[PDB]
Design a protein around this nucleic acid. Structure first.
Ligand SMILES: [Zn+2]
Ligand SMILES: [Zn+2]
Length: 105
DNA sequence: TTCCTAAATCAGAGATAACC
DNA sequence: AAGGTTATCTCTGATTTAGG
């Protein structure tokens, strides 16, 4: 078990939010008292596995992504290319390909 | 000093489940 | 096998404790 807000793996008392997640005591109390997520000393780590053996994006050729998706032909595509196609019904152009992947909140 | 926020601890409501 | 009692667990909310 780990806290959804801060990633802590131990706490004096586990609490939960209204949607199936666990919160450490500190984070749970903060949210209830203020209505906002408990601010972190340092950002909560995440990122995870960005590569997969034997896989690259059929549309932009990248080998790293936050989530491997599939195109209509059944080939793996990276998260950016799969989402761009869903929104625009055209493939994401190579001109949009960037050097790295950003992280958020 | 007193005020206030943060977060551990305490009380007990409701969930789980041992055992008859 | 199923159902009732109620020990015990696991939370939510109240209170206490500690610092700034
Ligand atoms: Zn937390
Ligand atoms: Zn791609």
């Amino acid at each position: 078990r780990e806290c959804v807000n801060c990633g802590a793996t131990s706490t004096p008392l586990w609490r939960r939010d209204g949607t199936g997640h666990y919160l450490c005591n500190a984070c749970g109390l903060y949210h209830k008292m203020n209505g906002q997520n408990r601010p972190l000393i340092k950002p909560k780590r995440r990122l995870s596995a960005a590569r997969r053996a034997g896989t690259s994006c059929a549309n932009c050729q990248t080998t790293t992504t936050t989530l491997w998706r599939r195109n209509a032909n059944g080939d793996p595509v990276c998260n950016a290319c799969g989402l761009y196609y869903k929104l625009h019904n055209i493939n994401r152009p190579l001109t949009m390909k960037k050097e790295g992947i950003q992280t958020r909140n």
